[PDB]
């Protein structure tokens, strides 16, 4: 239930009143730049959520996006959002699992995964499927949260809590993400630790929900809403809790 409810953002100032929606859009902008895409390419987006990132990509570059998810409501919302921005000709969404993708080999010019791989019960599988469907010359972009070091006591306690409510089936170090990418026979072009920029998202979104307590409360219940706010505030204070951007390429 804390899965499709937290979207990390890119924060730079320490001292500018930008919205949670502002920081999320900036992060997306780093991913757009990190894919390396030009007029006429095709892009696969794995774990599309409700479609915001894919619509932003389409507003920025002239490409075909297809988005993928294992939650039926989300596919319907994403498609409505696409049809609503008039991008139905090129932006489209369907229901499929990244552990077994139903696409032709070498279909896409590019692929991306924004905050989705930590759900997969096995990152390797997913990345292998992703390489299998990119054409040689094709590029990849990953954005996800990581554990920079092993933890204990109350630090481990605050991390576990987060994984429970967000369904984080596999959390790992950067070094682990890298060799997962290398196993799929992709070449790694950049890896950047953006912890310091991503961190503020946690307290800042705890605040947002608070402001909306009486309008979200009936959907989640009081105690559920409280545990989610508490769990973010705990995670914010464990500095072993990190975030990384990774670009990669197919020989
Ligand atoms: N095994 C899997 N295969 C394909 N999609 C999956 C998956 N496991 C989880 N997902 C989907 O991936 C998403 C992860 S949350 C990612 C949010 C999205 N990037 C956004 O900001 O809009 C969820 O929508 C979830 O339904």
Q: Where are the beta strands (DSSP E) in the chain?
A: 42-46, 64-69, 91-95, 108-114, 134-147, 187-193, 241-249
Class level of CATH domain 1-251: alpha beta
- Tokens found for residue 43: 């892009």
Domain ranges across the chain: 1-251
Does ligand 1 lie within 6 Å of residue 61's CB atom?
Answer: no
CA angle 20–143–247, rounded 5-degree value: 135
**Distance of CA 48 from the midpoint of ligand 1 (Å):** 6
Q: Whose CA is nearest to atom 22 of ligand 1?
A: 49
Q: 134 with 193: CB under 8 angstroms?
A: no
Q: 78 with 93: CB under 8 angstroms?
A: yes
């Amino acid at each position: 239930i804390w899965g499709e409810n937290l979207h990390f953002g890119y924060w730079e100032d320490a001292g500018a009143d930008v919205s949670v929606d502002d920081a999320t859009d900036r992060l997306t902008d780093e991913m757009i730049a990190l894919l390396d895409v030009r007029s006429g390419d095709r892009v696969l987006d794995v774990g599309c959520g409700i479609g915001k990132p894919a619509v932003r990509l389409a507003t920025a570059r002239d490409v075909r996006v297809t988005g993928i998810s294992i939650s039926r409501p989300q596919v319907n919302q994403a498609n409505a959002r696409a049809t609503a921005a008039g991008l139905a000709n090129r932006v489209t969404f369907s229901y499929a699992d990244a552990m077994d993708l139903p696409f032709e080999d070498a279909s896409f010019d590019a692929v991306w995964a924004l905050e989705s791989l930590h759900h997969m019960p096995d990152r390797g599988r997913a990345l292998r499927e992703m390489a299998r469907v990119l054409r040689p010359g094709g590029t990849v972009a990953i954005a996800d949260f990581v554990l920079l070091a092993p933890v204990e006591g109350a630090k481990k306690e605050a991390v576990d809590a987060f994984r429970a409510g967000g369904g984080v089936l596999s959390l790992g170090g950067i070094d682990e993400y890298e060799s997962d990418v290398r196993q799929a026979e992709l070449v790694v072009t950049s890896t950047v630790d953006i912890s310091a920029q991503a961190r503020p998202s946690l307290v800042k979104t705890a605040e947002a929900f608070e402001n909306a307590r009486s309008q979200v409360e009936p959907f989640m219940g009081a105690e559920g809403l409280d545990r989610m706010i508490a769990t973010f505030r705990g995670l914010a204070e464990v500095p072993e809790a990190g975030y990384v951007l990774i670009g990669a390429r197919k020989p």
